[PDB]
Design a protein around this ligand. Structure first.
Ligand SMILES: CCCCCCCCCCCCCCCCCC(=O)OC[C@H](COP(=O)([O-])OCC(O)COP(=O)([O-])OC[C@@H](COC(=O)CCCCCCCCCCCCCCCCC)OC(=O)CCCCCCCCCCCCCCCCC)OC(=O)CCCCCCCCCCCCCCCCC
Ligand SMILES: CCCCC/C=C/C/C=C/C/C=C\C/C=C\CCCC(=O)O[C@H](COC(=O)CCCCCCCCCCCCCCCCC)COP(=O)(O)O[C@@H]1[C@H](O)[C@H](O)[C@@H](O)[C@H](O)[C@H]1O
Ligand SMILES: CCCCC/C=C/C/C=C/C/C=C\C/C=C\CCCC(=O)O[C@H](COC(=O)CCCCCCCCCCCCCCCCC)COP(=O)(O)O[C@@H]1[C@H](O)[C@H](O)[C@@H](O)[C@H](O)[C@H]1O
Ligand SMILES: CCCCC/C=C/C/C=C/C/C=C\C/C=C\CCCC(=O)O[C@H](COC(=O)CCCCCCCCCCCCCCCCC)COP(=O)(O)O[C@@H]1[C@H](O)[C@H](O)[C@@H](O)[C@H](O)[C@H]1O
Ligand SMILES: CCCCC/C=C\C/C=C\CCCCCCCC(=O)O[C@H](COC(=O)CCCCCCCCCCCCCCC)COP(=O)([O-])OCC[N+](C)(C)C
Lengths: 81, 64, 89, 183, 469, 59, 50, 168
């Protein structure tokens, strides 16, 4: 209990597992735009997707609501990991 | 009361002059007339805010 | 509204998908403003008013002063460097 | 006489063609030369719709100043530029083929007021109906278009002309703010 | 009386020399002080949320707009009191932080452009005023021409602001195409039921919102903020945010907006987890700008957001302003100085600051606890009054993600303290020259507002009640 | 002498509670065109654009 | 003078000395942050536009 | 004929606790009816800008040594002090027309002068050299322009019929 529960698994849902979770998710949103020192072309091909992805997202929404939730979970997965 | 509402804002002014001395690495009483300047300035701010609140209360009283 | 939407969308994708020079960005930005004008002026005609033409004669001026400002920004960028890169700023 | 009918759809096709020659060119001057071609195709459309005054304002300032400005910049500056090769630009094709469809159809969606999302699009194309032009004899002086712009900029919207003064002011101050190096 | 200043000073700066620039900025500072002191009795015009439409359905003058109109002059006095005044009288401190000749002109042209949006009714005043202020940011950025990063930053900001300006003009044109009028009150609550307007009004919103840092397009702004010099960026981070956010909040065109709710959540996620592993101080500081500008699309979803907004904006402006001025003080004590335009770059560099002086770290501690919402501070009631409106109007998952975002954000706010209270090995025993008196009195006053604003919280609520209802 | 000094405070808090309920109802109350917009020029009615105007346009 | 600089998580961050602005360190691909080699150092400009 | 309003306008719609005279005062009227306590504010503002600059360099001098600023800046301080004093002067004196401040000695003068030009038979406000549509437009511009004194100066020079008064 003092090693497999108190220090083992209640820190995985505590300050040890969340340190690694935030380390991974921060590293991915940092590396969103890593290379391509042409930052103008890199930010400019990003403005197009974020008026296309939203524009298809709303089309998918107003036919059925349930089929955008896995889309949004998968966008969080590709964005944060 | 108006008087305590002046004294408290003047005490905020004394705190501004004190902390501004202490960032500059001066002693507590460095330019001890500057406490009078800040006290009068922030007390005047208390005058202003006190009178605005008075007039706002009277506008609410006249709506009945 | 076809000619305005087509200039806007195709000028926009000409802005987005360059990697070769800096001036194609400027001229695609300028033709986007043209594409907005082509839609606005026909809505002025078909509704019988000048007020879309009012916004037209204002946005002509703002496109002008936009070009003046932005090309002085480019000469700032070029003075300190030697040659404007191919890939971009 | 109905050779003289398709004149608008012609210039639409010419504008499509002309932007294809904007974004696919070798020199950086060839692109602005097709751009002044695009301005004059536009000015032909603006005369065609019933606006003779604007077309000449577009010639005055758009193949007027800002043309000469861009031609000038491309002269006295060196700018490296690659060609439209397939090995560097075919990777963008499956995004372009999505965004063409989506951005065009969505840009033709908002002219409608139904709530079906297929009757919204089909009101953009379902317009082959000829407006009827009556003669009303109510107007007495030739207040053309430019008179009314000069009446609305000067009385009803004098503040927009007067903020506009500050914008042109800024367009004078800015290049002297930058490109001088005082002392 | 901005233009009475601008027209006068532009002739005055045209003839003065390069040495006179400091004293010109001192003059303009004192001028703005006395415009705030001798002319601030115009609050009496409204007494029951009375709104005036001036210049003929073109400008709109109400009291929300009067408060923003007063807030911008106050923060401009604090910004202009930086360029006017020397930090120390040394060789380094003269060659650092030099104001250019045309800088003081471009500030007030930007304030004209920022005020004519919050006061704006027509779309054409909207468009001309976003253009005026966008130019002024193009040129406030590029005025330090002999900097490599600043020129690259101005050229990036140019094209991104240009795309979002054409997106706004497309939305304005499109609303004109579906309804003849330009004014927002042609809506008057009967249109929106019988008219599909949701797509137009969101594209008008998203056009301004993406100019500010709404988080799918957050990467370019962080780069511009890290690349400009450290004094351009306090101004160009404060001003466009508060100017257009009080526009979009005064005119509630996107209620229940699903796109706005998604991008609000995405902002609160990626800001609070983007600032986590970052070693540069202006970066950390700009993502603290991003999460806090994403407690804004939230109130933009609401109806009747004028206690939560205004309280949180003046909270955020004081807190923002104070922590930039803290690191501008902190550059004297650091051991390494690079990059003349941007002297402190890393948050590793302000180590051991408590052993240099303790009261600057006392100041830094109260501001960093005010960002994370610590209850006896003024920054707490801002989040409290956001949450008394989020939960008031049905946004429950928004509230949970707001809380989790605040907790993840506090982790990189407290890194500033973790660095600044540590052992340094090289303590200062005697500084020969001392920092400028007025420029440290300004920070002391901005602290004592933060730490003692809960005193006057109750007066503000009663005043508010009279003057907006 | 303490139950009375509580009744005073509880009246002083119920007064503030009723003050809040009022001032939260006074926000959502709809407002005139003369209070909300331009005080003089109280009509919304245009007569806009009178130079080449036609008799029979009013309704 | 500390052995391990921290980085708001359990991570190692580079202690940026004068020695990070070299011709070797120029043009190493990396995100806009966690990076050294500013383009504007008094050692990097080397009296440019002379 | 050149004095018919032909728009609809609120009548005696007071902006404060006191009765309005006037919805936009003509510039000559504002300079007429202002109190001596108002010329006070003009003088205090012309005094506060050069003394304000000399004070603000007594705090921290520009070149490290306390020297008086040059006469060159004291002249510009005097000019912009007259500018702030006139802005505060016009702003005060036209709050008195709106009935939002204390309105005692000017409601009597506006009984007096309006009654004294109803006896001379002329127009109650004055004949402008404008068509009545330009009077309407030019006074939709100058209505309530005293708010926004913080941005831009705008005044009434138009001499149009309507002022929110009882009959005309
Ligand atoms: C300090 C005071 C400000 C200067 C005052 C000088 C004017 C004056 O005293 O004349 C008294 C004089 C008194 O005559 P009156 O017999 O008693 O009655 C007038 C009649 O009713 C008038 O006859 P009417 O009723 O039939 O109406 C017709 C009238 C209709 O006239 C109008 O309706 C014009 C309305 C426009 C008002 C303009 C306000 C200014 C806006 C400032 C910029 C805002 C920027 C915002 C940008 C964002 O037409 C005119 O009379 C036009 C005369 C044109 C002369 C042009 C003189 C140029 C001087 C420019 C100076 C600028 C720099 C000064 C600062 C240094 O008034 C006039 O005759 C008309 C003066 C109109 C000139 C406006 C000049 C505005 C410049 C001031 C702005 C800067 C300072 C603020
Ligand atoms: C409700 C209560 C249940 C709480 C559950 C989780 C609470 C866990 C918690 O707060 O300790 C936090 C971890 O957490 C977060 O990393 C960030 C704390 C925010 C997590 C938000 C709480 C999530 C609740 C989800 C529902 C402590 O981080 P930590 O010291 O290891 O992280 C580092 C690390 O140790 C070293 O870099 C230094 O010590 C220092 O830089 C430090 O920041
Ligand atoms: C810069 C360059 C300029 C480029 C110009 C070229 C194009 C420009 C257009 C793009 C402009 C920028 C686009 C911005 C994003 C668009 C914003 C947007 O989605 O609004 C959608 C419109 O719902 C469609 O009907 C959306 C359906 C649209 C049709 C989908 C597209 C068809 C693709 C076919 C494949 C809805 O918003 P919203 O959350 O308020 O809507 C909610 C929600 O709909 C309801 O359930 C709620 O009850 C209600 O409260 C309401 O608020
Ligand atoms: C704006 C001010 C406030 C910003 C934040 C707002 C707070 C809300 C309102 C606050 C109300 C402010 C009222 C002004 C307060 C007036 C006031 O105390 O005297 C000043 C501060 O004077 C400003 O620093 C003047 C402050 C800035 C104004 C610059 C132009 C004057 C106190 O300096 P101080 O005695 O230590 O300065 C001393 C002293 O003058 C001599 O020993 C030496 O000559 C000198 O070198 C220095 O050591
Ligand atoms: C003698 C001067 C010496 C030189 C000083 C120069 C500049 C001083 C500038 C600012 C000092 C702080 C004054 C705050 C005024 C707030 C008015 C107001 O609460 O606004 C309310 C509505 O606010 C809101 O919605 C919410 C705002 C929430 C504020 C959050 C932070 C407040 C906590 C500290 C602020 C109070 C500290 C008092 C210190 C004694 C509207 O009422 P109002 O517009 O009629 O008030 C202005 C009347 N006036 C012009 C005559 C003063």
């Amino acid at each position: 209990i003092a090693h497999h529960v108190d220090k083992g698994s209640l820190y995985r849902l505590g300050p040890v597992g969340i340190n690694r979770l935030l380390n991974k998710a921060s590293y991915n949103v940092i590396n969103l735009s890593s290379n391509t020192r042409s930052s103008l072309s890199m930010n400019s091909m990003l403005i197009l997707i974020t008026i296309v992805s939203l524009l298809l997202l709303v089309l998918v929404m107003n036919v059925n609501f349930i089929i955008v939730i896995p889309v949004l979970i998968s966008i969080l997965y590709i964005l944060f990991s | 009361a108006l008087f305590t509402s002046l004294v408290g804002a003047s005490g905020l002014g004394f705190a501004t002059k004190f902390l501004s001395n202490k960032i500059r690495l001066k002693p507590a009483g460095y330019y001890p007339l500057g406490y009078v300047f800040s006290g009068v300035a922030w007390a005047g701010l208390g005058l202003v805010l006190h009178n605005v609140h008075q007039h706002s209360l009277e506008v609410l009283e006249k709506k009945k | 509204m076809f000619i305005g939407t087509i200039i806007l969308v195709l000028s926009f994708l000409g802005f987005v998908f360059n990697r070769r020079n800096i001036i194609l960005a400027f001229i695609c930005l300028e033709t986007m403003l043209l594409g907005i004008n082509l839609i606005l002026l026909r809505n002025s005609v078909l509704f019988d008013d000048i007020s879309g033409s009012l916004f037209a004669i204002v946005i002509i001026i703002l496109a002008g002063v936009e070009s003046a400002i932005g090309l002085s920004l480019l000469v700032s960028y070029y003075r300190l460097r030697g040659v404007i890169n191919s890939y971009g700023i | 006489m109905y050779l003289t009918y398709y004149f608008i759809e012609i210039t639409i096709f010419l504008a499509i063609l002309c932007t294809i020659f904007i974004i696919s060119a070798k020199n950086p001057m060839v692109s602005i030369l097709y751009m002044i071609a695009l301005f004059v195709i536009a000015a032909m459309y603006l005369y065609l719709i019933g606006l003779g005054i604007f077309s000449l304002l577009y010639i005055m300032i758009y193949i007027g100043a800002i043309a000469v400005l861009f031609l000038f910049i491309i002269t006295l500056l060196d700018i490296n530029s690659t060609e439209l090769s397939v090995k560097s630009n075919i990777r963008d094709l499956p995004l372009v083929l999505i965004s063409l469809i989506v951005l065009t159809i969505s840009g033709l969606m908002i002219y409608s007021n139904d709530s079906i999302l297929i009757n919204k699009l089909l009101e953009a194309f379902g317009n082959d109906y000829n407006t009827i032009i009556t003669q009303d004899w109510f107007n007495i002086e030739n207040t053309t278009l430019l008179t009314t712009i000069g009446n609305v900029l000067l009385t009803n919207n004098a503040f927009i002309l007067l903020v506009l003064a500050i914008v042109l002011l800024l367009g004078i101050i800015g290049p002297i703010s930058i490109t001088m190096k005082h002392k | 009386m901005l233009i009475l200043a601008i027209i006068s000073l532009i002739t005055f700066v045209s003839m003065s020399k390069l040495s006179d620039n400091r004293a010109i900025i001192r003059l303009i500072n004192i001028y703005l002080i006395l415009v705030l002191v001798l002319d601030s009795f115009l609050y009496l015009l409204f007494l029951n949320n009375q709104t005036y439409t001036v210049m003929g359905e073109l400008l709109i003058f109400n009291s929300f707009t009067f408060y923003i109109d007063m807030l911008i002059y106050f923060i401009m006095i604090v910004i202009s009191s930086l360029y006017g005044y020397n930090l120390y009288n040394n060789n380094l401190y003269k060659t650092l932080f030099e104001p250019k000749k045309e800088l003081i002109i471009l500030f007030l042209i930007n304030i004209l452009g920022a005020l004519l949006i919050v006061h704006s009714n027509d779309f054409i005043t909207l468009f001309v005023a976003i253009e005026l202020q966008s130019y002024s940011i193009y040129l406030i950025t590029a005025i330090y021409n002999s900097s490599y990063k600043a020129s690259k930053a101005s050229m990036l900001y140019f094209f991104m602001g240009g795309i979002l300006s054409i997106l706004i003009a497309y939305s304005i044109n499109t609303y004109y195409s579906v309804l003849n009028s330009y004014t927002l009150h042609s809506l008057d609550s009967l249109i929106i039921n019988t008219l599909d307007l949701n797509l137009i009004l969101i594209a008008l919103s998203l056009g301004l919102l993406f100019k500010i840092g709404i988080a799918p397009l957050h990467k370019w702004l962080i780069s511009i903020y890290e690349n400009t010099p450290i004094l351009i960026t306090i101004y160009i981070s404060l001003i466009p945010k508060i100017s257009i956010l009080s526009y979009l909040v005064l005119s509630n065109i996107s209620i229940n907006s699903l796109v706005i709710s998604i991008l609000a959540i995405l902002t609160l996620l990626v800001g609070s987890v983007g600032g986590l592993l970052q070693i540069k101080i202006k970066r950390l500081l700009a993502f603290s700008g991003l999460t806090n500008a994403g407690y804004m699309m939230l109130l933009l979803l609401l109806n009747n957001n004028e206690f939560s907004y205004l309280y949180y904006i003046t909270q955020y402006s004081i807190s923002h302003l104070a922590i930039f001025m803290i690191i501008i003080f902190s550059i004297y004590y650091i051991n390494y100085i690079n990059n003349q335009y941007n002297p402190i770059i890393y948050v590793n560099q302000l180590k051991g600051l408590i052993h240099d002086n303790a009261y600057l770290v006392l100041s830094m501690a109260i501001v960093v606890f005010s960002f994370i919402g610590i209850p006896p501070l003024l920054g707490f009631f801002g989040k409290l009054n956001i949450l008394m409106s989020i939960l008031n109007n049905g946004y429950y998952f928004i509230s949970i993600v707001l809380i989790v975002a605040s907790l993840i954000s506090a982790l990189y706010y407290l890194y500033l303290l973790n660095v600044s209270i540590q052992d340094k090995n090289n303590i200062l025993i005697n500084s020969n020259e001392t920092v400028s008196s007025v420029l440290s009195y300004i920070l002391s006053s901005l602290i004592i507002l933060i730490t003692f604003g809960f005193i006057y919280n109750s007066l503000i609520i009663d005043i508010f009640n009279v003057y907006f209802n | 002498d303490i139950l009375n000094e509580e009744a005073k405070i509880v009246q002083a808090l119920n007064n503030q509670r009723e003050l809040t309920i009022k001032m939260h109802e006074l926000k959502r109350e709809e407002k005139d065109y003369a209070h909300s917009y331009s005080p003089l020029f109280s009509d919304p009615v245009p007569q806009g654009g009178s130079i080449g105007k036609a008799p029979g346009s009013s309704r | 003078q500390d052995p391990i600089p921290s980085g708001a998580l359990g991570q190692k961050v580079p202690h940026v000395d004068e020695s990070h602005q070299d011709l070797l360190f120029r043009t190493s691909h990396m995100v806009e942050d966690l990076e050294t080699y500013d383009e504007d150092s008094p050692i990097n400009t080397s009296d440019a536009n002379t | 004929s050149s004095s018919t309003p032909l728009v609809k306008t609120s009548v005696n719609y007071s902006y404060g606790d006191y009765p309005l005279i006037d919805a936009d005062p003509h510039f000559k009227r504002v300079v007429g009816y202002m109190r001596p306590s108002d010329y006070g504010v003009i003088g205090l503002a012309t005094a506060a800008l050069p003394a304000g600059i000399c004070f603000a360099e007594w705090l921290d001098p520009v070149k490290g040594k306390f020297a008086r600023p040059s006469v060159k800046f004291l002249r510009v301080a005097t000019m912009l002090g007259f500018a702030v004093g006139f802005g505060a002067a016009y702003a005060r004196s036209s709050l008195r027309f709106f009935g939002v401040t204390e309105n005692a000695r000017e409601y009597k003068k506006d009984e007096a002068q309006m009654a004294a030009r109803k006896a001379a038979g002329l127009e109650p406000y004055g004949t402008s050299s404008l068509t009545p549509e330009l009077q309407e437009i030019a006074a939709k511009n100058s209505a309530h322009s005293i708010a926004g004194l913080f941005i831009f100066p705008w005044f009434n020079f138009v001499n149009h019929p309507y002022h929110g008064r009882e009959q005309k």
